[PDB]
Amino acid sequence: PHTYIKTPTYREPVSDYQVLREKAASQRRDVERALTRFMAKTGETQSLFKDDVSTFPLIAARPFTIPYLTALLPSEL
Amino acid sequence: DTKPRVAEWRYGPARLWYDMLGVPEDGSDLLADENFLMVTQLHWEDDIIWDGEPWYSIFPIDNEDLVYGRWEDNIIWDAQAMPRLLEPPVLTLDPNDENLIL
Amino acid sequence: LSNTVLPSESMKVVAESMGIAQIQEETCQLLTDEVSYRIKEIAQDALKFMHMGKRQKLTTSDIDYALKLKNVEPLYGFHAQEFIPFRFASGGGRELYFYEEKEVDLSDIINTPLPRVPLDVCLKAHWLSIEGCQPAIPENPPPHELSVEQQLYYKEITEACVGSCEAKRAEALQSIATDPGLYQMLPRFSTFISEGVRVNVVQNNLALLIYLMRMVKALMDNPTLYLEKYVHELIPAVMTCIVSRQLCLRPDVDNHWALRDFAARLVAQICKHFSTTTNNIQSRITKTFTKSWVDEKTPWTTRYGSIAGLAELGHDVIKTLILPRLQQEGERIRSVLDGPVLSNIDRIGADHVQSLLLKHCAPVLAKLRPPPDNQDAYRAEFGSLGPLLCSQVVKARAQAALQ
Amino acid sequence: RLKPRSIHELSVEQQLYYKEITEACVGSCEAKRAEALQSIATDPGLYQMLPRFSTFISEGVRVNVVQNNLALLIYLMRMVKALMDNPTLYLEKYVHELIPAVMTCIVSRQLCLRPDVDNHWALRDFAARLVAQ
């Protein structure tokens, strides 16, 4: 079978709960790190250390005009 | 035929373009084969190394659309005189690609 | 379209409420074109009390004012607050609909809660428009799915590359180029880029196309994500930025020319990194560029794009594609040194094509000719390509001296 | 919407020969080497597997001259010679990978012991110059 057999093959599926938990965890951590570094670089920034923007940038605290609306209200519903 | 564009989603990826457009809801002899063989089109000399210093697939599976499809039919040669009418494509999340959780 | 009447089988049913056993079909046709004629004369005379008494609703007191007008006796009991109920009866072969009327004890109408007393008609004055627009008084009218983290990241990154400011764009492109986990958001970026390059046909925006090509160039520089599964979408977008003819809103002043050589460098990179013998990316890109260049009737912009891509592919491509059609330069200089219409837009595109052609064919002439090159320009087409080749040999000598 | 799970353009079985012929052509046993060789020189259905053979040759010589492993190279050059005399397959789509591999066998320095196998090295350059012309 090779001269004539023509049975298809598939790609190796990764059904492992350990590596799926690791993949989803690391992708979520990387996308939230990329998002927070992008938002701290393109805005007002604070720093725990003197002149520290490259490592650990903090998005600066802005005051709200009505703070209970952004505190108490649910965003996913 | 004139192409004025058509949009069917306004809610998936490219929603920003759809909103900017304002499409509401779902409403809408040098051509000889040898010339193109890569022996005659590639500086393969640079490769020569001088003084250098199966039940599941063994090989990877290629993009069937790139390998087989005529993507050349999505090139817009003339904006006004577009031979066919292009339609909005929905996101198709291919699961053959690894690095995608689902 | 046609004269619509009540059905003739609705008069056989009515004639059996009377007691008439057999009624022939010519009598039933004689009945239904008269009763549907008298319906249309009270439908249109009820509409004369709906219009003259300004109501636009056609209440049941409009039909009762029209039956009073046609002398026919009124229909009693249609002013009470009712609706349209019907009750289906299946039966053993007799299909019909009826009312299913209900009863009520008489002391429960003597002891109903009375509605509230009505008010009398009074007048009220208010300004509708005061020398202009309406006032804002209350008498007027008032006027697989991305997680939220990466949904927010997708929104911020895509809206940073639409053109509000340049610094946020540079940080967004430096995010796309240098983040480790941007998979699961690659299909969204590919769809965004390809649809956005398509939206150039509705609005010929050069700037947003330059931004999308810098988005593709940033996506290519990411070491972590592999664009092999999504390159079939990004190839025709860059191809559309190369070989389309109107890349500009004002064709004469917009430098569509740079989005041409930038996207040509981009497609040379996209077929250096991804062309495999199973893919046939580079051969299929050269074939599209070649049959767009050799074929006449093509505009000078799309010929510029074809020559730019073919000349960014490499040296052997311009040896075996560009150099046979160097006589085409004569067909170009037909419309440059001697044009009946000088003030058209063909001249700037033609001498742009000329400048690109002789710039890219000068090292090819420096590779496959003698070192002297005395009258190679005269032997060349128009004698200019040869001057450029002499300049190229001089530049090569200068580079050797620098080395 | 998820696009269907694609299949490789080779049978699951198809992958195996690729595997038996390549594991025989690295020359652990000489009669095997030959059995594989016989196959490569006259299999009519060896097209549509030829990208994977050309890539295995090319990639092999380049990571096989990092340490100058002469047999690994003499076996790959014999695999090239067995690929060429097959009359059915169309080779000049793949010769852009084949030619810089043979030039490297002929024009390269030998990282392993300089003398002794230089006799074979001359043949490595003899087999490479034969297939080059």
XYZ file of C-alpha atoms in Angstrom:
715
model
C 0.000 0.000 0.000
C 2.040 3.091 -1.055
C 1.996 2.108 -4.654
C -1.792 2.244 -4.404
C -2.928 2.865 -0.834
C -4.099 6.482 -0.488
C -5.226 6.887 3.103
C -5.055 10.472 4.390
C -3.192 11.647 7.474
C -3.792 14.544 9.848
C -1.720 16.854 12.010
C -0.778 15.898 15.572
C -3.493 17.236 17.922
C -2.460 18.622 21.322
C -5.302 17.578 23.645
C -3.469 17.964 26.932
C -5.059 19.945 29.752
C -1.700 20.955 31.250
C -0.271 22.506 28.094
C -3.641 24.063 27.183
C -3.821 25.742 30.600
C -0.210 26.890 30.121
C -0.892 28.246 26.614
C -4.044 30.148 27.614
C -2.371 31.497 30.764
C 0.777 32.701 29.010
C -1.159 34.237 26.121
C -3.444 36.124 28.526
C -0.462 37.347 30.578
C 1.420 38.450 27.448
C -1.512 40.303 25.913
C -2.297 42.105 29.166
C 1.373 43.035 29.613
C 1.532 44.348 26.035
C -1.697 46.307 26.536
C -0.593 47.911 29.799
C 2.861 48.836 28.472
C 1.291 50.376 25.362
C -1.179 52.378 27.433
C 1.464 53.536 29.903
C 3.823 54.602 27.112
C 1.236 56.650 25.166
C -0.095 58.641 28.101
C 0.765 60.252 31.383
C 2.912 57.912 33.437
C 4.075 57.473 37.012
C 6.975 55.471 38.381
C 7.895 53.788 41.641
C 11.571 54.551 40.958
C 13.238 57.777 39.854
C 12.860 58.186 36.068
C 11.598 54.657 35.445
C 9.548 54.434 32.258
C 11.084 51.418 30.477
C 10.761 49.038 33.443
C 7.472 48.976 35.418
C 5.553 51.883 33.847
C 2.393 52.882 35.702
C -0.588 54.467 34.000
C -1.102 57.740 35.834
C -4.094 58.124 38.111
C -6.727 60.327 36.625
C -9.603 61.709 38.711
C -13.155 61.041 37.596
C -15.922 63.597 37.825
C -18.309 60.888 39.078
C -16.300 57.996 40.578
C -19.130 55.699 41.708
C -20.163 55.095 38.097
C -16.812 53.598 37.179
C -16.472 51.838 40.533
C -19.804 50.178 41.301
C -21.151 49.444 37.844
C -20.536 46.028 36.260
C -18.948 46.034 32.834
C -19.631 42.455 31.661
C -23.306 41.544 32.006
C -17.868 47.454 -13.784
C -17.672 50.235 -11.121
C -16.821 48.983 -7.600
C -18.511 51.095 -4.854
C -17.744 48.423 -2.167
C -20.325 46.385 -0.137
C -20.271 45.502 3.602
C -22.148 42.617 5.327
C -20.940 42.810 8.958
C -20.146 46.210 10.591
C -19.594 44.115 13.775
C -16.588 41.823 13.174
C -12.886 42.664 12.561
C -12.806 45.714 10.174
C -15.917 47.199 11.911
C -13.898 50.459 12.138
C -13.654 50.608 8.310
C -17.338 49.682 7.975
C -18.404 52.486 10.427
C -16.165 55.065 8.655
C -17.855 54.049 5.360
C -21.294 54.134 7.048
C -22.803 50.792 5.855
C -25.777 50.191 8.249
C -26.458 46.686 9.697
C -26.316 43.968 6.984
C -27.380 46.463 4.271
C -24.973 46.637 1.290
C 7.993 34.831 -24.710
C 8.892 36.462 -21.336
C 5.756 34.691 -20.109
C 7.357 31.305 -20.953
C 7.228 28.929 -17.967
C 11.030 28.706 -17.659
C 11.441 32.418 -17.005
C 9.534 31.858 -13.718
C 11.447 28.716 -12.523
C 13.449 29.846 -9.505
C 16.798 28.606 -10.913
C 16.577 31.543 -13.385
C 15.319 34.046 -10.784
C 17.318 33.364 -7.660
C 20.882 34.239 -6.648
C 21.447 30.654 -5.465
C 25.197 31.193 -5.633
C 24.945 32.983 -2.255
C 23.810 29.695 -0.709
C 27.034 27.760 -1.594
C 28.764 27.437 1.831
C 32.460 28.435 1.606
C 34.680 28.104 4.743
C 31.563 28.072 6.879
C 31.954 28.830 10.626
C 3.884 8.086 10.298
C 0.287 7.724 11.607
C 0.198 11.504 12.252
C 2.040 13.822 9.799
C 5.891 13.907 10.008
C 5.859 17.042 7.779
C 3.806 20.235 8.416
C 0.547 20.953 6.503
C 0.682 24.033 4.210
C -1.953 26.778 3.820
C -4.347 25.184 1.260
C -5.595 28.655 0.282
C -2.031 29.916 -0.503
C -0.956 26.633 -2.108
C -4.199 26.146 -4.109
C -6.522 29.212 -4.115
C -6.343 31.996 -6.701
C -5.668 34.850 -4.276
C -4.525 36.737 -7.378
C -8.281 37.315 -7.932
C -8.345 39.613 -4.879
C -5.780 42.030 -6.469
C -7.665 45.261 -7.431
C -5.951 46.185 -10.754
C -8.289 49.139 -11.541
C -10.467 50.659 -8.800
C -13.221 51.973 -11.176
C -13.072 49.123 -13.747
C -13.144 46.148 -11.336
C -13.862 42.977 -13.384
C -15.950 41.313 -10.618
C -17.816 42.513 -7.471
C -15.924 41.777 -4.221
C -18.028 40.795 -1.165
C -17.254 41.093 2.587
C -15.515 37.945 3.959
C -16.402 36.745 7.524
C -13.532 35.787 9.910
C -12.962 32.009 9.428
C -10.566 31.194 12.375
C -8.609 28.265 10.804
C -7.890 25.593 13.515
C -5.040 23.944 11.491
C -2.744 26.739 12.791
C -1.201 26.012 16.220
C -0.749 28.941 18.700
C -4.542 29.469 18.507
C -6.258 28.046 21.641
C -9.322 26.954 19.575
C -52.834 44.898 -9.897
C -56.210 43.215 -10.392
C -59.770 43.656 -9.163
C -59.784 41.807 -5.829
C -63.111 40.394 -4.622
C -64.357 38.133 -1.859
C -63.973 34.425 -2.722
C -66.806 32.586 -4.431
C -66.550 29.742 -1.905
C -67.402 32.231 0.851
C -70.871 32.620 -0.701
C -71.632 28.893 -0.693
C -71.034 28.923 3.070
C -73.319 31.947 3.499
C -76.042 30.394 1.318
C -76.192 27.342 3.596
C -76.824 29.512 6.649
C -79.913 30.558 4.665
C -80.997 27.017 3.800
C -80.113 26.974 0.104
C -78.757 23.487 -0.555
C -77.204 23.796 -4.027
C -76.070 27.125 -5.484
C -74.415 27.094 -8.897
C -71.043 28.725 -9.499
C -72.392 31.422 -11.832
C -74.720 32.611 -9.056
C -71.842 32.691 -6.556
C -69.819 34.806 -8.978
C -72.870 37.069 -9.325
C -73.019 37.534 -5.538
C -69.366 38.247 -4.776
C -68.710 40.962 -7.360
C -71.622 42.934 -5.891
C -70.780 42.584 -2.202
C -67.110 43.367 -2.885
C -68.308 46.346 -4.905
C -70.311 47.677 -1.951
C -67.386 47.074 0.408
C -65.146 49.319 -1.702
C -67.791 52.080 -1.685
C -67.919 52.126 2.122
C -64.160 51.622 2.412
C -63.663 54.820 0.418
C -66.464 56.798 2.095
C -65.232 55.933 5.574
C -61.912 57.385 4.373
C -63.672 60.703 3.689
C -64.527 61.070 7.376
C -61.008 59.970 8.342
C -59.533 62.746 6.189
C -61.982 65.618 6.655
C -62.152 64.907 10.349
C -58.376 64.774 10.669
C -57.647 61.418 12.310
C -55.443 59.096 10.113
C -56.704 56.053 12.052
C -60.080 54.987 10.531
C -61.995 54.287 13.715
C -65.234 52.310 13.575
C -67.270 55.521 13.846
C -66.065 56.351 10.328
C -67.747 53.295 8.818
C -70.897 53.991 10.838
C -70.934 57.517 9.414
C -70.684 56.026 5.918
C -73.373 53.370 6.366
C -75.552 56.271 7.534
C -74.592 57.989 4.267
C -75.587 55.057 2.030
C -79.005 54.745 3.827
C -78.211 51.169 4.952
C -79.094 50.180 8.533
C -76.256 50.554 11.085
C -74.194 47.739 12.576
C -74.907 47.606 16.305
C -72.235 46.843 18.871
C -68.895 47.902 17.355
C -68.019 50.886 19.571
C -67.018 48.800 22.590
C -63.340 48.181 23.302
C -62.670 44.945 21.421
C -60.092 43.474 19.025
C -59.870 40.701 16.418
C -60.188 37.210 18.007
C -60.815 34.031 16.007
C -61.079 30.429 17.184
C -60.132 27.533 14.912
C -62.333 24.428 14.745
C -60.659 21.420 13.131
C -63.518 18.928 12.884
C -63.978 15.811 10.809
C -63.583 17.542 7.451
C -65.295 20.923 8.018
C -62.731 23.665 8.658
C -64.027 26.952 10.051
C -63.439 29.847 12.451
C -65.862 31.327 14.987
C -66.030 33.809 17.860
C -66.361 31.787 21.120
C -68.318 34.454 22.947
C -68.159 34.540 26.738
C -70.597 35.421 29.508
C -70.447 37.576 32.630
C -72.692 37.780 35.685
C -74.905 40.859 35.642
C -73.944 42.046 39.124
C -70.289 42.230 38.011
C -71.183 44.973 35.541
C -73.295 46.897 38.069
C -70.285 46.741 40.419
C -67.420 47.450 38.031
C -64.849 50.122 38.971
C -65.871 53.260 37.116
C -63.266 54.954 34.889
C -62.119 58.468 35.658
C -64.157 61.492 34.553
C -63.034 63.120 31.268
C -61.669 66.638 30.912
C -63.072 69.468 28.821
C -61.368 70.927 25.762
C -59.077 73.838 26.591
C -56.535 75.845 24.636
C -52.784 76.126 25.104
C -50.388 78.556 23.438
C -46.657 77.949 23.006
C -43.927 79.120 20.657
C -43.011 76.664 17.905
C -40.223 78.701 16.286
C -38.818 82.034 17.447
C -37.432 83.858 14.360
C -35.470 80.721 13.532
C -35.032 77.326 15.153
C -37.399 75.816 17.696
C -37.064 76.546 21.425
C -36.218 73.756 23.853
C -39.489 73.971 25.802
C -41.108 70.596 26.719
C -43.977 71.175 24.246
C -41.499 70.525 21.402
C -39.661 67.424 20.198
C -36.353 66.844 21.939
C -33.757 67.566 19.194
C -13.147 31.942 19.273
C -14.332 35.339 20.608
C -11.465 37.499 21.921
C -11.360 37.976 25.735
C -11.945 41.540 26.960
C -8.163 42.088 27.556
C -7.234 41.298 23.940
C -10.436 42.881 22.624
C -9.304 46.120 24.266
C -5.763 45.595 22.945
C -7.118 45.061 19.420
C -9.265 48.197 19.678
C -6.444 50.414 20.962
C -3.871 49.087 18.493
C -6.147 49.431 15.455
C -7.377 52.900 16.423
C -3.799 54.012 17.057
C -2.979 53.364 13.379
C -5.783 55.446 11.855
C -4.032 58.794 12.079
C -4.844 60.899 15.117
C -1.180 61.387 16.009
C 2.164 59.971 14.912
C 3.699 59.102 18.303
C 0.887 56.741 19.328
C 1.201 55.173 15.871
C 4.932 54.600 16.336
C 4.360 53.030 19.748
C 1.573 50.843 18.333
C 3.814 49.632 15.507
C 6.615 49.003 17.997
C 4.076 47.023 20.008
C 3.007 44.912 16.998
C 6.620 44.299 16.003
C 7.901 43.364 19.484
C 5.290 41.477 21.483
C 5.420 37.723 22.223
C 1.783 36.713 22.481
C -0.132 38.387 19.639
C -1.366 35.082 18.139
C -5.175 34.602 18.458
C -5.275 38.222 17.215
C -3.423 37.599 14.000
C -6.612 36.701 11.986
C -8.283 39.894 13.190
C -5.287 41.971 12.084
C -5.172 40.248 8.704
C -8.898 40.858 8.167
C -8.551 44.488 9.282
C -5.638 45.108 6.921
C -7.157 43.392 3.873
C -10.592 45.040 4.323
C -8.912 48.420 4.930
C -6.908 48.161 1.712
C -10.166 47.206 -0.013
C -11.856 50.347 1.427
C -9.356 52.417 -0.604
C -11.634 51.899 -3.643
C -14.466 53.854 -1.982
C -12.072 56.508 -0.627
C -8.708 56.865 -2.387
C -6.797 57.712 0.793
C -3.048 57.493 0.272
C -2.297 58.140 3.946
C -4.351 55.273 5.374
C -2.777 52.938 2.817
C 0.692 54.024 3.950
C -0.432 53.324 7.522
C -1.712 49.855 6.605
C 1.510 49.046 4.749
C 3.518 50.096 7.823
C 1.164 47.815 9.814
C 2.076 44.902 7.521
C 5.778 45.793 7.731
C 5.478 45.778 11.520
C 3.661 42.433 11.464
C 6.498 40.898 9.448
C 9.195 41.923 11.946
C 7.611 39.996 14.824
C 9.793 36.960 15.619
C 7.159 35.101 17.632
C 4.191 35.008 15.261
C 4.281 32.972 12.057
C 2.407 34.537 9.146
C 2.450 31.382 7.008
C -1.224 30.592 7.578
C -2.364 34.169 6.886
C -0.060 35.250 4.051
C -2.754 34.536 1.427
C -4.619 37.586 2.756
C -1.662 39.955 3.064
C -0.214 39.188 -0.384
C -3.133 40.653 -2.430
C -3.386 43.671 -0.109
C 0.233 44.654 -0.785
C -0.340 43.721 -4.431
C -3.324 46.098 -4.502
C -1.070 48.801 -3.070
C 1.424 48.087 -5.872
C -0.435 47.552 -9.156
C -3.605 49.574 -8.738
C -3.858 52.718 -10.885
C -5.541 55.338 -8.701
C -3.658 55.376 -5.402
C -4.284 59.100 -4.891
C -7.201 61.494 -4.359
C -5.438 64.256 -6.306
C -3.418 62.174 -8.821
C -0.922 64.911 -9.783
C 0.453 65.985 -6.341
C 0.063 62.830 -4.156
C 3.305 60.760 -4.095
C 1.590 57.399 -4.726
C 5.058 56.635 -6.016
C 6.447 55.949 -2.498
C 3.618 53.651 -1.420
C 4.733 51.930 -4.606
C 8.379 51.238 -3.809
C 7.613 50.673 -0.107
C 5.031 48.008 -0.932
C 7.378 46.576 -3.577
C 10.118 46.179 -0.959
C 7.451 44.663 1.292
C 6.413 42.057 -1.264
C 10.056 41.191 -1.994
C 10.431 40.517 1.722
C 7.159 38.551 1.849
C 8.357 36.270 -0.947
C 11.859 35.971 0.451
C 10.698 34.745 3.868
C 7.781 32.585 2.748
C 8.351 31.253 -0.778
C 8.659 27.468 -0.717
C 8.413 25.100 -3.685
C 5.022 23.957 -2.382
C 3.913 27.596 -2.082
C 5.057 28.955 -5.483
C 4.628 32.449 -4.075
C 7.487 34.122 -5.953
C 6.768 32.507 -9.319
C 3.074 33.422 -9.080
C 3.984 37.048 -8.070
C 6.488 37.384 -10.936
C 3.885 36.017 -13.340
C 1.289 38.610 -12.297
C 3.874 41.419 -12.498
C 5.113 40.152 -15.873
C 1.746 39.833 -17.575
C 0.834 43.242 -16.171
C 4.014 44.758 -17.612
C 4.309 43.107 -21.042
C 0.612 43.696 -21.791
C -0.114 47.029 -23.433
C -3.067 49.350 -22.418
C -1.735 49.343 -18.848
C -1.460 52.771 -17.198
C 1.892 54.281 -16.277
C 1.119 53.916 -12.570
C 0.520 50.165 -12.774
C 3.518 49.757 -15.085
C 5.524 51.675 -12.474
C 4.314 49.262 -9.809
C 5.137 46.220 -11.944
C 8.650 47.482 -12.736
C 9.178 48.417 -9.063
C 8.232 44.981 -7.737
C 10.162 43.119 -10.449
C 13.215 45.246 -9.761
C 13.008 44.722 -6.015
C 12.919 40.937 -6.477
C 16.570 40.808 -7.513
C 19.239 40.908 -10.185
C 18.391 37.794 -12.195
C 14.740 38.843 -12.483
C 15.723 42.163 -14.061
C 18.133 40.237 -16.276
C 15.431 37.943 -17.642
C 12.316 40.152 -17.380
C 13.229 43.841 -17.642
C 16.109 43.732 -20.171
C 14.169 42.104 -23.082
C 11.635 44.977 -23.093
C 14.179 47.818 -22.951
C 12.932 48.784 -26.439
C 9.694 49.751 -24.640
C 11.669 52.799 -23.416
C 11.435 54.067 -27.005
C 7.648 53.695 -26.801
C 7.897 55.669 -23.572
C 10.068 58.408 -25.076
C 7.538 58.676 -27.900
C 5.315 60.399 -25.315
C 8.016 62.352 -23.435
C 10.380 64.098 -25.854
C 7.464 64.719 -28.280
C 3.884 64.804 -26.904
C 0.957 66.614 -28.631
C -0.633 67.051 -25.143
C 2.007 68.308 -22.676
C -0.307 69.401 -19.831
C -1.744 65.901 -19.222
C -0.694 63.649 -16.295
C 1.079 61.022 -18.454
C 4.388 62.921 -18.524
C 5.189 62.862 -14.787
C 4.330 59.155 -14.604
C 6.310 58.412 -17.755
C 9.505 60.073 -16.584
C 9.055 58.492 -13.144
C 8.902 55.122 -14.945
C 11.985 56.198 -16.930
C 13.953 57.205 -13.821
C 13.116 53.954 -12.001
C 13.979 51.925 -15.114
C 17.393 53.456 -15.666
C 18.210 53.461 -11.927
C 17.525 49.725 -11.710
C 19.064 48.851 -15.087
C 22.312 50.709 -14.397
C 23.818 47.930 -12.165
C 22.475 45.291 -14.568
C 24.331 47.101 -17.346
C 27.352 47.280 -15.033
C 27.226 43.497 -14.552
C 26.935 42.267 -18.163
C 29.016 44.660 -20.269
C 32.613 45.789 -20.893
C 34.423 48.054 -18.428
C 34.987 50.816 -21.020
C 31.360 51.540 -22.054
C 32.319 54.135 -24.649
C 29.093 54.411 -26.733
C 26.945 51.838 -24.807
C 24.452 54.698 -24.254
C 24.247 55.216 -28.062
C 23.831 51.407 -28.388
C 21.239 51.653 -25.551
C 17.697 53.035 -26.097
C 17.530 56.889 -26.181
C 21.219 57.136 -25.123
C 20.153 57.936 -21.521
C 20.135 54.434 -19.949
C 23.778 54.260 -21.163
C 24.670 57.547 -19.398
C 23.038 56.142 -16.220
C 25.135 52.922 -16.666
C 28.329 55.039 -16.921
C 27.265 56.841 -13.712
C 26.644 53.395 -12.073
C 30.141 52.139 -13.085
C 31.580 55.368 -11.565
C 29.556 54.732 -8.345
C 30.848 51.109 -8.200
C 34.449 52.394 -8.593
C 33.789 54.879 -5.733
C 32.414 52.015 -3.547
C 35.542 49.919 -4.326
C 37.743 52.912 -3.333
C 35.760 53.256 -0.049
C 36.290 49.498 0.621
C -16.875 29.386 11.617
C -13.787 27.085 11.671
C -12.081 26.087 8.365
C -11.877 22.243 7.950
C -8.878 20.393 9.338
C -6.667 19.858 6.332
C -4.798 16.702 5.397
C -1.226 16.390 4.203
C -0.859 15.852 0.470
C 0.778 12.528 1.251
C -1.042 9.419 2.601
C -0.303 8.618 6.249
C 1.395 5.623 4.688
C 2.912 7.981 2.139
C 4.902 9.680 4.884
C 6.424 6.318 5.921
C 8.327 5.538 2.729
C 9.636 9.039 2.788
C 10.751 7.762 6.069
C 12.084 4.310 5.131
C 13.884 5.584 2.013
C 15.502 8.481 3.880
C 16.530 6.282 6.811
C 17.987 3.772 4.348
C 19.769 6.456 2.299
C 21.825 7.626 5.305
C 23.750 4.413 4.718
C 23.697 2.342 7.887
C 23.650 -0.812 5.739
C 24.937 -0.943 2.178
C 22.310 -3.253 0.641
C 19.586 -1.054 2.135
C 21.250 2.057 0.909
C 20.916 0.289 -2.442
C 17.324 -0.813 -1.917
C 16.454 2.814 -1.317
C 18.697 3.823 -4.185
C 16.927 1.412 -6.478
C 13.649 2.959 -5.451
C 14.695 6.539 -6.056
C 16.103 5.872 -9.528
C 12.960 4.201 -10.880
C 9.847 4.973 -8.777
C 7.294 6.513 -11.173
C 5.226 8.019 -8.368
C 8.151 9.821 -6.767
C 6.826 13.156 -7.967
C 4.653 15.039 -5.404
C 7.165 13.779 -2.808
C 10.084 15.543 -4.510
C 9.910 18.866 -2.531
C 10.464 16.911 0.689
C 13.423 15.017 -0.856
C 15.029 18.193 -2.222
C 14.567 19.942 1.114
C 16.040 16.934 2.955
C 19.093 16.952 0.682
C 19.678 20.746 0.768
C 19.073 21.130 4.481
C 21.222 18.074 5.166
C 24.371 19.177 3.353
C 24.280 22.643 5.000
C 24.050 21.247 8.592
C 26.343 18.384 7.513
C 29.259 20.659 6.549
C 29.097 22.321 10.002
C 30.988 19.142 11.026
C 32.574 17.698 7.829
C 30.826 14.284 7.956
C 32.060 12.656 4.738
C 29.729 9.628 4.611
C 26.678 11.762 5.313
C 27.782 13.758 2.260
C 28.746 10.840 0.022
C 25.320 9.279 0.667
C 23.531 12.555 -0.111
C 25.469 12.964 -3.370
C 24.518 9.416 -4.346
C 20.912 10.357 -3.507
C 21.227 13.353 -5.864
C 22.605 11.098 -8.616
C 19.740 8.657 -8.017
C 17.271 11.546 -8.214
C 18.659 12.756 -11.529
C 18.523 9.605 -13.671
C 14.861 8.957 -12.809
C 13.060 9.670 -16.111
C 9.550 10.305 -14.769
C 10.047 13.236 -12.395
C 10.434 16.895 -13.395
C 13.608 18.185 -11.757
C 14.348 21.717 -12.967
C 11.809 23.198 -10.560
C 14.063 21.929 -7.745
C 17.517 22.416 -9.244
C 17.851 25.809 -7.505
C 18.192 23.820 -4.270
C 20.207 20.989 -5.818
C 23.045 22.998 -7.392
C 24.316 25.020 -4.341
C 24.414 21.731 -2.402
C 26.791 20.123 -4.907
C 28.881 23.280 -5.281
C 29.350 23.158 -1.475
C 30.554 19.511 -1.624
C 33.183 20.518 -4.267
C 34.330 23.998 -3.103
C 34.301 23.492 0.660
C 37.006 22.950 3.367
C 37.005 19.663 5.284
C 36.392 20.142 9.088
C 37.300 16.441 9.800
C 40.818 14.857 9.582
C 42.601 16.556 6.633
C 44.556 13.511 5.208
C 43.537 9.806 4.814
C 39.899 10.415 3.701
C 41.163 13.135 1.331
C 41.214 10.121 -1.017
C 37.449 9.975 -0.506
C 37.409 13.793 -0.420
C 38.720 13.705 -3.996
C 35.859 11.317 -4.796
C 33.416 13.582 -2.866
C 34.732 16.233 -5.312
C 34.711 13.555 -8.103
C 31.044 12.628 -7.483
C 30.137 16.301 -7.086
C 31.900 17.368 -10.293
C 30.236 14.472 -12.164
C 26.760 15.490 -11.045
C 27.652 19.166 -11.623
C 28.527 18.685 -15.277
